[PDB]
Design a protein around this nucleic acid. Structure first.
Ligand SMILES: OC[C@H]1O[C@@](CO)(O[C@H]2O[C@H](CO)[C@@H](O)[C@H](O)[C@H]2O)[C@@H](O)[C@@H]1O
Ligand code: MG
Length: 580
DNA sequence: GCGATCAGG
DNA sequence: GCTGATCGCA
């Protein structure tokens, strides 16, 4: 059953054909400055395995890799491209990425390796990576014979699977989504990750010192009020102190014990002074452990930069995710946590951070897809959407909208943007499910077009089995037919929400591609560093700010043309914190 | 390893 | 509502 192939000791001309399935294996999960353990090539002439030290030192092979006219089919090309960038080698001509193809066909399958993608087309002549490399403290690279056969089988699977995957994408009207959006985006993300973001470690360390002192003060105060010392970080130990020793009311319980989440503590604060201190401790501890110590752990000592990895094939909405570190959830709401952003600085002297964000892109997308007259008019007038929503649902003039009314209208809009249930809204506003439902009812009366859309999209999901986005991304919802109210309800809200969130994801991805093309045409040194769902973060020479102030918003606003305009806000400064 | 927690959009 | 990082405890 063994698969034939040549275990080459040298690179030959037949290995450099203009079309091939290529495997440049990086076993380490985090591929930054990571080892390439082997290379496999499959083309019209045969199957070949090459030792990295050999292939990567060969001028012809390196030239072949960087030749845009020599087309390669791969799985997770970004991983290979980045690992190669760290070695000063350019990878060009990737015309098909099986990971991205599988992801577009069905994001819910969780395809994470060639074997998983192959199984989608009943191809099983390849082993899962985990079976070959193991996992955890057991994860390691097998002897050459085992490694070589695995890489060749993966290349062979890619070679065989390109056509059927492209055929199905074509049927789904997703061929352009792969070739014109996701694949070009993959290269841009590779550049962003490789560039990394500079961190002011001295500043971070100084902050940690301060928090350490503040944590010590609050920590001691907590034992003072509790009358004893315990592990505040232990929900179990803390639960004992709060609900047994101090006799605080049990307003909520968890699957295993007493609930001590912030929302619960907030309600208990009036009963005892220890509560506010626990909350403060929680806040400081979160910053210290996750955003100070955690960040410092992944900063590269030599360059002082962090190189995140964007997972482009994970979410069912089309959004990106960020890891090691996660740069999509750096604090900003509270001033104390916001200061963390002062640690993210430009990578060069006299450069600045530039940040541009879409203003309410999700609700604008909803106005467009639902063709709701009221919502479209609101955005055409560039109204404060929360104030407008409050005016409509509570039936009052703009002057009559109170701060509490706007806050609740804003919560309703938040619920619409993320597709939360009436139960979730009730929880967020600390009201009854019935009152939350009444708010939603009033909203649909004010925005009948949105109501019709939500009804129609649910019916469409049930009829076709999936829902789609502006650029044809797809999400299957098998649970839409469940006879279980909760399971079905969740699916219906995803049917409602995915076209909204997913289309917003499509738009910013296209904006990134359009922006990089524009930056190159204008020969600006400015470059993308991060994407945080509805915002783009760049760095550039201070002398390019004025040009970026006009260029970036324009490109982002013109990425697509909707029934309502798109609006982009922007700021720049010496640190990410200052780009506000 | 996994629940409980909390950060962002 | 989701994804990722932390912690404590299995
Ligand atoms: O290279 C990213 C790419 O690989 C997958 C597996 O095919 O994820 C792996 O690498 C990520 C970055 O280190 C990890 O977060 C993840 O746990 C690991 O399996 C894909 O999901 C991703 O698109
Ligand atoms: Mg915004």
């Amino acid at each position: 059953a063994k698969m034939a192939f040549t275990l080459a000791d040298r690179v030959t001309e037949e290995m450099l054909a203009d079309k091939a399935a290529l495997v440049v294996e990086v076993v380490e999960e985090n591929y930054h400055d990571a080892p390439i353990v082997g290379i496999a090539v499959v083309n019209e002439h045969g199957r070949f395995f090459l030792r990295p030290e050999t292939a990567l030192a060969d001028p012809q092979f390196v030239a072949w890799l960087g030749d845009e006219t020599k087309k390669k089919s791969m799985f997770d090309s970004k991983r290979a491209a980045v690992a190669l960038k760290w070695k000063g080698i350019e990878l060009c001509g990737v015309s098909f990425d099986l990971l991205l193809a599988a992801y577009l066909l069905d994001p819910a399958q969780g395809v994470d390796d060639v074997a998983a993608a192959a199984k989608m087309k009943q191809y099983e002549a390849v082993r899962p990576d985990e079976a070959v490399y193991g996992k955890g403290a057991k994860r390691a690279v097998p002897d050459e014979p085992v490694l070589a056969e695995h890489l060749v089988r993966k290349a062979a699977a890619i070679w065989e699977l390109e056509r059927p995957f492209l055929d199905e994408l074509r049927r789904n009207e997703q061929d352009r989504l792969l070739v014109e959006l996701e694949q070009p985006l993959s290269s841009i993300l590779a550049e962003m990750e490789f560039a990394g973001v500079k961190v002011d470690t001295k500043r971070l360390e100084q902050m940690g010192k301060e928090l350490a002192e503040q944590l010590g003060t609050v920590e001691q105060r907590i034992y003072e009020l509790a009358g004893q010392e315990f592990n505040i970080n232990s929900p179990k130990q803390l639960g004992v102190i709060l609900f047994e020793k101090l006799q605080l009311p049990v307003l909520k319980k968890t699957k295993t014990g007493y609930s001590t989440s912030a929302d619960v503590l907030e309600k208990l604060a009036p009963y005892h002074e220890i509560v506010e201190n626990i909350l403060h401790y929680r806040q400081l501890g979160k910053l210290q452990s996750t955003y100070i110590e955690g960040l410092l752990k992944v900063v590269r000592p030599d360059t002082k930069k962090v190189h995140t990895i964007f997972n482009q094939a994970l979410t069912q909405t089309g959004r990106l995710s960020s890891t090691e570190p996660n740069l999509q959830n750096i604090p900003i709401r509270l001033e104390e946590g916001r200061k963390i952003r002062q640690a993210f600085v430009p990578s060069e002297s006299d450069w600045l951070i530039f940040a541009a964000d879409y203003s309410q892109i999700e609700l604008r997308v909803l106005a467009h897809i639902a063709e709701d007259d009221n919502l479209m008019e609101a955005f055409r007038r560039d109204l404060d959407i929360h104030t407008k929503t409050a005016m409509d649902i509570f039936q009052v003039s703009e002057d009559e909208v109170t701060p509490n009314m706007r806050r609740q209208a804003k919560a309703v809009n938040f619920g619409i943007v993320y597709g939360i249930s009436d139960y979730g809204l009730a929880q967020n506003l600390n009201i009854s499910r019935k009152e939350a439902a009444e708010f939603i009812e009033r909203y649909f009366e004010s925005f009948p077009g949105v109501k019709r859309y939500m009804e129609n999209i649910v019916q469409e999901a049930k009829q076709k089995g999936y829902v789609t986005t502006l650029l044809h991304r797809r999400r299957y919802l098998p649970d839409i037919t469940s006879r279980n109210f909760n399971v079905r309800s969740f699916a219906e809200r995803m049917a409602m929400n995915t076209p909204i969130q997913g289309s917003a994801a499509d738009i910013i991805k296209k904006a990134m591609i359009d922006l990089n093309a524009r930056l190159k045409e204008e020969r600006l040194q400015a470059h993308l560093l991060l994407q945080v769902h509805d915002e783009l973060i760049l760095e550039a020479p201070k002398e390019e700010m004025e040009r970026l102030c006009r260029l970036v918003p324009e490109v982002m606003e013109q990425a697509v043309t909707l029934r309502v305009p798109l609006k982009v806000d922007y700021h720049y400064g010496s640190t990410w914190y200052d780009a506000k």
